[PDB]
Design a protein around this ligand. Structure first.
Ligand code: ADP
Ligand code: ADP
Ligand code: TYD
Ligand code: TYD
Ligand code: MG
Lengths: 189, 184
């Protein structure tokens, strides 16, 4: 069970992934919750540079890929041990933020993601959609309005490219409403 | 002008490149010296991580590329201001060390390098060869069998493109080598 949460800043990812972790734990599931960038000792060192320092779009992309490669190395084992792995952001983020947001190109980033993850693809990905103004009012260097609009639109394209994996949630709903939707979709495995 | 030096840890890179600067400073030429990994503020942070931490081959590779794309942007400026760029280690480093040394594939690393460096190829690159024990005599990237692989990687790369890579015998004298480079 490999599930990821995606969406722009302020969409509600961190909140929802935790509510989901509790629900699966209470039901007697071995849950592993991780975030990106970060999730490993060195990945967290990488995360601090990405947030604290300004970098070119390609270097920025390579840093997210390094952190991702390190995180994958660890979670794969968990997955191969009956553990449920929940991730706060994954490959779609690089596609949406660096592919669309920074305009490096959807295809290029996806190919790099493939090399970086050795093909580990989520079974289920919750994309929480919300308009930018709402997200920013409720919610770093990534939160610029225009940038985030391109990101949001990029995520919507991705939802269209992988409808089997990506489940689009309506971020305008209440926190508890969305959680209902989340649990409802999980119930199907 | 864009110059770069390659070769394993202890082949005589820092020594040569300098001696090729104090020569150009001597003849007016405005040169700037940069090294990889590092060369920029964030790059030195990435450098620290690569030397102090244990990372998987790919993370290792992506960290070098991140550092390279940052420096490259800064190098495009100097070769825009008419400067002279002497660089200790570059794309070949990733190919030999990550491609062959880590066995991630020559073409793979080569393509990432293109993407990360926006197709910036050095005019002249000096590959300084030496056996492993000698170099060691003179970090985590220094395990004989690995270096062996890296050396092989450098030589197989020297074959491919003999257009810019000029080999030298680091087992020689510092002045002997120097002279050989001063020519080009
Ligand atoms: N559906 C929601 N309705 C109202 N506020 C929300 C909703 N989801 C999240 N928030 C609030 O927005 C802020 C950031 O949420 P977070 O879960 O941290 O979003 P992300 O992790 O997507 O930035 C918090 O105050 C969170 O409680
Ligand atoms: N041609 C040479 N012959 C003998 N020793 C050399 C030669 N070139 C460099 N050295 C010495 O090898 C050691 C490492 O050289 P360095 O220039 O630091 O190599 P790298 O920069 O490849 O580590 C130093 O003692 C340097 O003076
Ligand atoms: C995983 C990933 C994150 N990011 C950015 C998006 C976030 O603004 C930043 C920090 O992630 P997070 O801490 O998840 O930010 P937020 O809680 O506001 O959503 O990382 C990318 O640009 N590319 C990526 O691949
Ligand atoms: C630029 C680069 C360096 N390296 C390694 C070479 C060294 O082991 C380490 C530090 O490089 P460097 O400081 O040049 O050390 P040396 O003088 O011994 O050559 O980084 C790679 O593995 N890949 C790369 O792309
Ligand atoms: Mg969050």
């Amino acid at each position: 069970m490999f599930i990821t949460f995606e969406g722009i800043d302020g969409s509600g990812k961190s909140t929802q992934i935790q509510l989901l972790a509790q629900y699966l734990e209470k039901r007697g599931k071995k849950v592993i919750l991780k975030r990106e960038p970060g999730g490993t000792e060195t990945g967290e060192k990488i995360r601090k540079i990405l947030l604290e320092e300004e970098v070119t779009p390609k270097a920025e992309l390579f840093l997210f890929l390094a952190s991702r490669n390190l995180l994958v190395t660890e979670i794969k084992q968990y997955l191969s041990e009956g553990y449920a792995v929940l991730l706060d952001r994954y490959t779609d983020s690089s596609v949406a933020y660096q592919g669309f947001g920074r305009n490096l190109g959807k295809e290029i980033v996806e190919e790099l993601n493939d090399f970086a993850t050795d093909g580990l693809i989520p079974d289920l990905t919750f994309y929480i959609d919300v308009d930018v103004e709402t997200a920013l009012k409720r919610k770093n260097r990534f939160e610029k309005r225009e940038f985030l609009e391109r990101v949001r639109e990029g995520y919507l394209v991705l939802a269209r490219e992988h409808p089997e994996r990506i489940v689009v949630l309506d971020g305008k709903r209440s926190i508890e409403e969305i959680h209902r939707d989340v649990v409802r979709e999980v119930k199907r495995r």
